[PDB]
Design a protein around this nucleic acid. Structure first.
Ligand SMILES: [Zn+2]
Lengths: 48, 114, 215, 120, 122
RNA sequence: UUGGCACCUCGAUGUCGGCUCAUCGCAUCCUGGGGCUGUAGUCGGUCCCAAGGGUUGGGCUGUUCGCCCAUUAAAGCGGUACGCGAGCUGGGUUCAGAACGUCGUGAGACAGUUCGGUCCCUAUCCGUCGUGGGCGUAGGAAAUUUGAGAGGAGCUGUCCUUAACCGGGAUGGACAUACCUCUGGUGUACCAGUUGUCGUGCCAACGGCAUAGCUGGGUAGCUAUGUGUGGACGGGAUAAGUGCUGAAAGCAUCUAAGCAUGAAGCCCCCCUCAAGAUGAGAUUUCCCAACUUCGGUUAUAAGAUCCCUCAAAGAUGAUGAGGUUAAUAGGUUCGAGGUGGAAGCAUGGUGACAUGUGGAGCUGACGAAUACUAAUCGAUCGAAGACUUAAU
């Protein structure tokens, strides 16, 4: 129900090994040389 | 269709000699029996109370009264132990399942005709 | 002796003579062939390998299992066969009676045969102790605060721990199961179906393995 | 069938509003869960319109709402009149379809996934 | 499906009108009984006269369960009420009349005197 | 068990009974095997080997015990903080109220009863039930596998025959497991009947709200009380035993050397998991160049992935069906199953209503067809195989 010891910095940075985020799909647009998400519309002269 | 290969395998067992009836009708089923020595047929006459299913899995339930005690009997429609079915009357109802007749007796439990 | 692969399509009933009723499973055992033989001198054990369902041919830019790939397109081309979906063990079959390239036909089984059917059972999800195992509920009134919980998971100071095998909640469902001593009710060679008496593991469109029983 | 986080009484009323908004605006931005669900509601109504008779105009009124459309130069129209008159003549040779979903990014205040629904 | 504490109607003329199930015979830990099975019961309601009196602890055979029996043909038979017949340990009845219909499952039990005294056996 | 001692714990180691879930011992309650009997048979009495599995529902009492009722092959005895309150309950017992008998001058009390009466905690670590990612397994991949090791399962009534043993049959009880064809349950985007009230201007048709307003049915899926299957037949080595040949001991003796026989138990046989089994195994398939400063390096190959349409899979992730050279979902078309005769119209009736057109009309998940809409264009990862020795 409550922690018996504190958590060391070593054990805290290992648990956070997998707490990260990945970049999006983000391909280049053919109409404008740009970047857009895959399968979404372009936010710059919206084409698809 | 239900599924090919199921209508194609169970097709040789669909009977093609029974009449066509409805819930509310009266039937006289000639079921066959094997007691200790021989084969005999025993008639069972009552109201059809429900038909459910489709294909070889179809069934129906007829209801009678014996000595004040109700006895409902259920058959697989294409069973090879029914010798013949005969439609005595054709009553007039408003539902597909006559389950309300279970709580009725006498003049309260009468089905019309035509 | 007498293996075959097939797919479960569903249950029905038939009427045997004497007017019995027989629940039945319909299996679709179409396009089996022999893909390879394993011998004691090369592999250490005898068996034959069988592939069940026909798969489309190799194409570049294929983005799914619908098409064979170059490693599998070639293995099924040592024997002269099209690519197969499923490919299995058959170890209790005498290998000398088969040739690589044969077509294991549904007629190998005859009505009256005792068989074992293997398949992966359905799959249920995360389940609790009451559904997953067969455990009792607590009282549903009388002050109770114990309804679907597992019991006590251990004892006390002696064995200050849980033993391996406690029956807690977790993923229930899809395992490998044999049912033994089932029966062949009828073989239909024009459609290539086996009518098995009873029921078998898994979902519809799932893979099953029929073998003659071990007794 | 999705359930969309509502109760079956609120989920029904929310699609009768989504459907009557496609009939009027021809194009709306929703979320992508309400778009996949409401395409089925508005396409089953287009076939009632292009079916034509009176008994199918009686079954379209069980779903559409009582809204008036202001045409050009004050010629008002009911959303059930616009569906059986005008949306039922341009879709008279198409066999299914009628509608188009287009994805956009996540919106800002929650990362819900924006979408546009058109009529094709 | 009869279990302990189930009340049946008596379908002979032995003096009893209602019984209470005390135990279903058979095996150890056995939970329910059906047509053709033998229960131990007690008389809860009798008729003035007759051999069986209120409070007796008797044995009975089950006839006419309200959730009936399934046959090998895929046939079924259900009844409107549960009943039983007080028997004598040689499997013969204690009365001499039997009321109402009766199921054909009583032949495998070898209750030939109950099936023959009864109006139509179904 | 009742105790002796007072060594651990007073800045807290939570009682009795019951519930849930077990786990071990054997000094064995049943089932298996035997010796002796004062064992004729059927039943026994006693002692030995044996822990594989099994070992019940109620009445009375807070009870534990105990006594009864009805069953069973049997109703074993003990340990585990007299197992288990960060799993549950709170009936007994020793909180504040009140009363009876009793004791006390009294305040009060029990050498005794009676009625009432507050059980907190969001899991940090080991533990254990599931499910992923990284690296390794001397090139990179895709499949199929051996099985070192591990976990399951193990129960036994009655009847027929032989006619009490040993032999043969047929059917049950209780437990396991898989499944939805059958009998049933549920089925909140399925069909129908109906009440009050506010609406769509009115009539007729309909919509909101009233537990899904209420009521009668019910498809798929999920389900037991439903439907199927299982513990079969057997091998190896032994226990208590029963022996054969045979001496130490010119005889005898199952034992010392030899040789058999012998149990529900032991090791297999059956069923699942299993190369992180760092000892990392095995089969048959696929791919295999340019550049150096000769150290090595790049991108690419075969293969995957991102992203998207999904379900037979699912907390997520993983697993599976597919991505235009396309049936993966939706729509559309035709069906299965479910409901049980729509609307409009006409006729009959004074009217509520009835009949016909017409097994009508609707219909979510189930079976087939059909590119009409969406699975567009793209992007990331991913090999060129170390040195020793021995044979070719
Ligand atoms: Zn652009």
């Amino acid at each position: 129900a409550v922690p018996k010891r504190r958590t060391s910095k070593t054990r805290k940075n290992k648990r956070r090994t997998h707490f990260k985020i990945s970049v999006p799909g983000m391909t280049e647009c053919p109409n404008c040389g740009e970047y857009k998400l895959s399968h979404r519309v372009c936010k710059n002269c919206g084409s698809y | 269709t239900n599924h090919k290969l199921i209508e194609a395998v169970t097709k040789s067992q669909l009977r093609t000699d029974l009449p066509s009836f409805r819930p509310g009708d009266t039937l006289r089923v000639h079921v066959r029996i094997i007691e200790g020595t021989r084969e005999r047929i025993q008639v069972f006459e009552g109201v059809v109370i429900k038909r459910r299913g489709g294909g070889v899995s179809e069934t129906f339930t007829v209801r009678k009264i014996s000595s004040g005690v109700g006895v409902e009997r259920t058959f697989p429609l294409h069973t090879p132990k029914i010798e013949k079915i005969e439609v005595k009357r054709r009553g007039k109802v408003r539902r597909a399942k006559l389950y309300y007749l279970r709580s009725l007796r006498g003049k309260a439990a009468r089905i019309q005709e035509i | 002796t007498k293996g075959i692969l097939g797919r479960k399509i569903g249950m029905t009933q038939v009427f045997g003579e004497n007017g019995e009723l027989i629940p039945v499973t319909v299996v679709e055992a179409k396009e089996n062939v022999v893909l390879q033989k394993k011998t004691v001198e090369v592999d250490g054990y005898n068996a034959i390998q069988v592939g069940f369902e026909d798969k489309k041919a190799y194409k570049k830019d294929a983005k799914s299992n619908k098409y064979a790939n170059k490693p599998a397109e070639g293995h099924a081309k040592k024997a002269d066969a099209a690519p197969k979906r499923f490919i299995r063990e058959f170890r209790n079959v005498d290998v000398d009676a088969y040739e690589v390239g044969q077509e294991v036909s549904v007629d190998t089984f005859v009505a009256g045969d005792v068989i074992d059917v293997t398949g992966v059972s359905k799959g249920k999800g995360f389940q609790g102790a009451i559904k997953r195992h067969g455990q009792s509920r607590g009282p549903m009134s009388h002050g109770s605060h114990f309804h679907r919980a597992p019991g006590s998971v251990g004892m006390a100071s002696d064995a200050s721990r849980v033993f391996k095998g406690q029956k807690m909640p977790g993923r229930m469902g899809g395992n490998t199961v044999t049912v033994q001593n089932l029966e062949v009710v009828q073989v239909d060679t024009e459609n290539k179906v086996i009518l098995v008496k009873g029921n078998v593991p898994g979902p519809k469109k799932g893979l099953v393995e029929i073998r003659t029983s071990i007794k | 069938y999705r359930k969309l986080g509502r109760t079956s009484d609120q989920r029904k009323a929310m699609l009768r509003d989504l459907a009557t908004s496609l009939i009027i605006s021809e194009r709306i931005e929703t979320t992508e869960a309400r778009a996949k669900e409401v395409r089925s509601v508005v396409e089953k109504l287009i076939t009632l319109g292009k079916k034509g008779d009176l008994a199918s105009r009686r079954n379209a009124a069980k779903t559409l709402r009582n809204v008036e459309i202001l045409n050009e130069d004050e010629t008002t129209q009911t959303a059930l009149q616009k569906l059986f008159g005008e949306i039922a003549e341009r879709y008279t040779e198409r066999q299914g379809g009628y509608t188009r979903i287009l994805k956009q990014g996540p919106r800002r205040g929650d990362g819900a996934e924006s979408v546009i629904i058109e009529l094709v | 499906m009869i279990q302990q504490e189930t009340r049946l109607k008596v379908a002979d003329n032995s003096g009893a009108r209602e019984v209470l199930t005390i135990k279903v015979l058979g095996g150890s830990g056995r939970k329910t009984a059906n047509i053709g099975d033998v229960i131990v019961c007690t008389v809860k309601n009798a008729t003035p006269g007759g051999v069986v009196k209120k409070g007796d602890v008797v044995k009975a055979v089950i006839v006419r369960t309200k959730s009936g029996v399934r046959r090998n043909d895929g046939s079924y038979i259900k009844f409107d009420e549960n009943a039983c017949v007080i028997i004598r340990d040689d499997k013969g009845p204690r009365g001499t009349r039997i009321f109402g219909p009766v199921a054909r499952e009583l032949r495998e039990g070898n209750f030939m005197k109950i099936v023959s005294l009864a109006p139509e056996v179904l």
